[PDB]
């Protein structure tokens, strides 16, 4: 029993974190095989990079200096070729995630991992992370069996305190750019499918006060959910929630009627899984994984 915001074990990623220094800027790099990946803002980036030589980039892996033997850019990520392949390189893939999908972030400072937390890619493409100066280059990932899927690299903080970054191929999540200019997160919405997943998790953990005898149509649910800045629920979301619906005996649209009632009437002094707000940073897969005990 119990339900926590759980991150993947970070060990496989910790062995990849390095410190990258160029000029006055120090940030984090991800060392995989013989390449160190980091935000290109450490260096017109084609014009700025052409003036740099390999020895301008100081890469430190623990108490060992790696020698940079090449450099290239891919979108907003700088790829520093080093002379040594990381012996700790795990089985990995670079994957781009969609809004609503969750991942773990290994927050680092000076190439030294400081903490691990779980978060979700918001529908507005920001992440509500916890980062200070020096955290750039910190990465987001998921683990599938023994394979690490790297999905995020931290680049910047927006004026509202939220964060923006890229996938590991340097493509930003969201309409952001990596420079000092006026940028703002768009109005965010609640990840409906994730709230429903969390309501199923609450039911599995014995919290059933919010259940009701009612059901709703998908269209009526979406009309109501649009009023509360909730993301539309699609038939794909309904299909994805099928296993949780079968386990608890609460049809997805039956849970939607519970959600509609919670949006219209509130919690009335009650909590669900120790929360007074509807939690949207657990996917249906996260709920199944935590309420089953999958290991890596």
State the catalytic residues.
41, 136
Please list the residues that pair with 72 across neighbouring strands: 79
Q: Does residue number 275 form part of the binding site for a second copy (CB under 8 A)?
A: yes
Interface with ligand QOO by CB under 6 A: which range of 48-56, 106-114, 174-182, 200-208?
174-182
- Binding string, residues 19-48; x marks residues near ligand QOO by CB under 6 A: ----------------------x-------
Interface with ligand QOO by CB under 6 A: which range of 15-23, 175-183, 196-204, 227-235?
175-183
| Short-list 290, 4, 8, 5, CA closest to 152 | 8
User: How many of the other CB atoms lie within 10 Å of CB of 131?
Assistant: 20
- Considering CB under 6 A, how many residues would be counted as binding ligand QOO? 17
- Considering CB under 8 A, how many residues would be counted as binding a second copy? 52
Q: Are 60 and 21 in contact (CB under 8 A)?
A: yes
> Which residues 6+ apart lie within 8 Å of 63 measured at CB?
none
Write the CA distances from 183 to 138, 139, 174, integer angstroms: 21, 22, 11
Rounded-to-integer distance, Cα 161 and Cα 85, Å = 36
Rg (CA), the chain: 21
Nearest approach, Cβ of residue 273 and ligand QOO (Å):
16
Interface with ligand QOO by CB under 6 A: which range of 51-59, 132-140, 225-233, 271-279?
132-140
Whichever of 123 and 221 has its CB closer to a second copy, that residue is: 123
* Phi, psi (degrees; rounded to nearest 5) at 36: -110, 120
Binding site for a second copy (CB under 8 A): 1-12, 14-15, 106-110, 112-117, 119, 128-135, 157, 161-163, 205-206, 271, 274-277, 290-296
* Contacting positions for ligand QOO (CB under 6 A): 1, 41, 131-133, 135-136, 155-159, 163, 178, 180, 182-183
């Amino acid at each position: 029993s119990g339900f926590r915001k759980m991150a993947f074990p970070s060990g496989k990623v910790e062995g990849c974190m390095v410190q990258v220094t160029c000029g006055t800027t120090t940030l984090n790099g991800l060392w995989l095989d013989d390449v160190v990946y980091c935000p290109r803002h450490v260096i017109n980036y084609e014009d700025l990079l052409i003036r740099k030589s390999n020895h301008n980039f100081l890469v430190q892996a623990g108490n060992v200096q790696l020698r940079v033997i090449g450099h290239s850019m891919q979108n907003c990520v700088l790829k520093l070729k080093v002379d040594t392949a990381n012996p700790k390189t795990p089985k990995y893939k670079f994957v781009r995630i969609q809004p609503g999908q969750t991942f773990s972030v290994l927050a680092c400072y000076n190439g030294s991992p400081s903490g691990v937390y779980q978060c979700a890619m918001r529908p507005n493409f920001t992440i509500k992370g916890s980062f200070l100066n020096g955290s750039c280059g910190s990465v987001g990932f998921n683990i599938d069996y023994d394979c690490v899927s790297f999905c995020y690299m931290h680049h910047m903080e927006l004026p509202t305190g939220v964060h923006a970054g890229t996938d590991l191929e340097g493509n930003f999540y969201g309409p952001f750019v990596d420079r000092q200019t006026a940028q703002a997160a768009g109005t965010d919405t609640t990840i409906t499918v994730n709230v429903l997943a969390w309501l199923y998790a609450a039911v599995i953990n014995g919290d059933r006060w919010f259940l009701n005898r009612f059901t709703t149509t998908l269209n009526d649910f979406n009309l109501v959910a649009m009023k509360y800045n909730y993301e539309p629920l699609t038939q794909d979301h309904v299909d994805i929630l099928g296993p949780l619906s079968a386990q608890t005996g609460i049809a997805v649209l039956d849970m939607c009627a519970s959600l509609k009632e919670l949006l219209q009437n509130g919690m009335n002094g009650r909590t669900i899984l120790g929360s007074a707000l509807l939690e949207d940073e657990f996917t249906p897969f996260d709920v199944v994984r935590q309420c089953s005990g999958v290991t890596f």
